[PDB]
Amino acid sequence: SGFRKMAFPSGKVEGCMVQVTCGTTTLNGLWLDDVVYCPRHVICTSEDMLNPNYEDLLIRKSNHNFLVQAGNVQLRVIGHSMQNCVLKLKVDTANPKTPKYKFVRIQPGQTFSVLACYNGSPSGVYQCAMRPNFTIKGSFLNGSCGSVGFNIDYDCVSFCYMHHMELPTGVHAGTDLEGNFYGPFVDRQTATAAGTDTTITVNVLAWLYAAVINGDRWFLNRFTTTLNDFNLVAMKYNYEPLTQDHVDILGPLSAQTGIAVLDMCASLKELLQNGMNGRTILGSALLEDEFTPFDVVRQCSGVT
Amino acid sequence: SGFRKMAFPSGKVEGCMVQVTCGTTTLNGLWLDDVVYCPRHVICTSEDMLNPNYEDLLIRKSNHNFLVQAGNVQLRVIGHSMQNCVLKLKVDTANPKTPKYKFVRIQPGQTFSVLACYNGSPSGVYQCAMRPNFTIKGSFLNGSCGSVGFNIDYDCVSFCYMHHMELPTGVHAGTDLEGNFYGPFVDRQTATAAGTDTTITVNVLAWLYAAVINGDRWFLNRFTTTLNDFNLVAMKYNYEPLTQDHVDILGPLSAQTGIAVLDMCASLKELLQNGMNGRTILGSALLEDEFTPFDVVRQCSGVT
């Protein structure tokens, strides 16, 4: 028993993190096969980050202006292309610790582990959710850029995120591994604010099921509700509307625990209307929305 | 900026996790050099566990009754000793991915990352604090035993925990890597209860400093207090008494932020007496005590 915000093992990813340096600016890169991927703002100086012209900046760069380094060993760059907001540096050595991988684009509400690095070296690993407003709330500082987010299905590493910037609200923005940003953000320092951050709801439900599986039942009630009467309430508290697809997704957990999804929705309705009244759920005093149904089922049934 | 409960990279440890099977019972083991360490209750059946005599149980066991396996590859056991609550199985192959390591015994309030495994295979990694009452609150299920807790100092892996059991209160107990339990617990299924757990006050303070460093100041006040007047209040809310040694430890964070420890103590006093009144701190609605001062300084200054 017990339930914790657990992240995927980071070993396979550690083997791929290298350091990329262009002039003065240094950041992390991902080394898969004989290709190194990294945030393109590597080529910027601090001076022109206000609104850099990356096409013009790249024209004046050559292979040798990029210093890629796998720990102690130097990597020779033998080609470089800009793909959206990422650089693809071809190196002359294939990473032999390159795992089976895929590049994926996740949806808001889905989760992944981030391996935060500095100078191509691991710092630590934590779990994130891609927020409805297409930001994430992690821990990054300078040098963090090029740190990747990912999931693991047995042998295969699904890379879904590469870190690029932090918004003035204290939240973070990045791209997929094809260099396409999540949300309306761009790799330049303008006053781009984030949109309203809403609560994922289905995830809160999954987490309430996790709570039941691990011995918390105080929040359960004899009440039930309709999707419509639930959603009328949920919207008031800045929650994503719950759809029939969401209900379908919550099926396995509902069946496992023998608590109907609409009964659990009723409990969440009571929780939102009246608060927790001093009590806690799995050691939290507010409703957690960064656990997917698959996350809960994974942890609770000990998947490797 | 931003502050998450980050967990150390698990790669070096992953390389050491093997599967150990004795008869029907299977659990995880740690393979360092040519030695495999694992919880001794591996030799028990289901019945045995009520109150096993391990000396008597070990009489009928031989090298060949232990099936050690590093993923797909089989390990030949060529010797086995019982050292406290752990078995030391000597195998005929030295783990070539054996990192620089130490075995350490942690103190209550100190933290470490746990790599939860099943059938010698990684599941995930999360951070823990050794509680004042010598338990931890993690995620373990059957087959998790032999999962290890650890810290990393550059090249060196400091193994400090190996998982053994879950108490009826839903909390977890284990040993160090010499097989000596943390707290008064034993590897048998009797009603041996844990002591009342208190809150690690110094850690809560460190975490409030983390909050300040990452842009939360709403909880700061024009009040200050004495250690004595603080502790009178802290005792009421089941908090560890704060000592001058604790104050000394909080020096660097106090100096960095320019907020006296006793001013921060006053803020914690207000927080405890009046609650957070709808606001949050680093995305939590109750006071976190599983971050050490060293944890905060590490994360905030991007140590690898």
Residue numbers in the entry:
A (entry chain B), B (entry chain A): 1 to 304
Sentences from the paper on this structure:
Mpro is a cysteine protease that mediates the cleavage of viral polyproteins during viral replication and is a high-profile antiviral drug target. The SARS-CoV-2 main protease (Mpro) is the drug target of Pfizer’s oral drug nirmatrelvir. The emergence of SARS-CoV-2 variants with mutations in Mpro raised the alarm of potential drug resistance. The X-ray crystal structures of the representative Mpro mutants S144A, S144L, M165Y, E166Q, H172Y, and Q192T with and/or without GC-376/nirmatrelvir provide a structural explanation for the drug resistance.
Q192 locates at the S4 pocket and forms a hydrophobic interaction with the trifluoromethyl substitution from nirmatrelvir. Q192T (9.2-fold lower kcat/Km), Q192S (8.9-fold), Q192L(4.3-fold), Q192A (6.2-fold), Q192I (5.6-fold), Q192P (7.6-fold), Q192H (8.2-fold), Q192V (9.0-fold), Q192W (8.0-fold), Q192C (7.0-fold), and Q192F (3.5-fold) had comparable enzymatic activity as the WT, and all showed resistance against nirmatrelvir (>22.2-fold increase in Ki). Cross-resistance was also observed with PF-00835231 (>25.5-fold) and GC-376 (>7.7-fold). S144L, M165Y, H172Y, and Q192T represented some of the biggest changes in both the residue size and the enzyme activity, with a decrease of ∼127×, 39×, 13×, and 10×, respectively, in kcat values. Interestingly, in the GC-376 complex structure of S144L as well as Q192T, the thioacetal hydroxide is placed outside the oxyanion hole and hydrogen bonds with H41, unlike most previously determined structures. This suggests that the interactions between the oxyanion hole and the inhibitor thioacetal hydroxide, as well as, by extension, the substrate transition state, are likely weakened in the S144L and Q192T mutants, resulting in an alternate conformation in the inhibitor crystal structure. In addition to these effects on the reaction center, the M165Y and Q192T mutations also directly impacted ligand interactions in the S4 site. The Q192T mutation increased the plasticity of the surrounding residues, allowing them to better accommodate the terminal benzene ring of GC-376, which assumed a different conformation compared with the other mutants. For example, to avoid the drug resistance caused by the Q192 mutant, which is located at the S4 binding pocket, one can design inhibitors that do not bind to the S4 pocket.
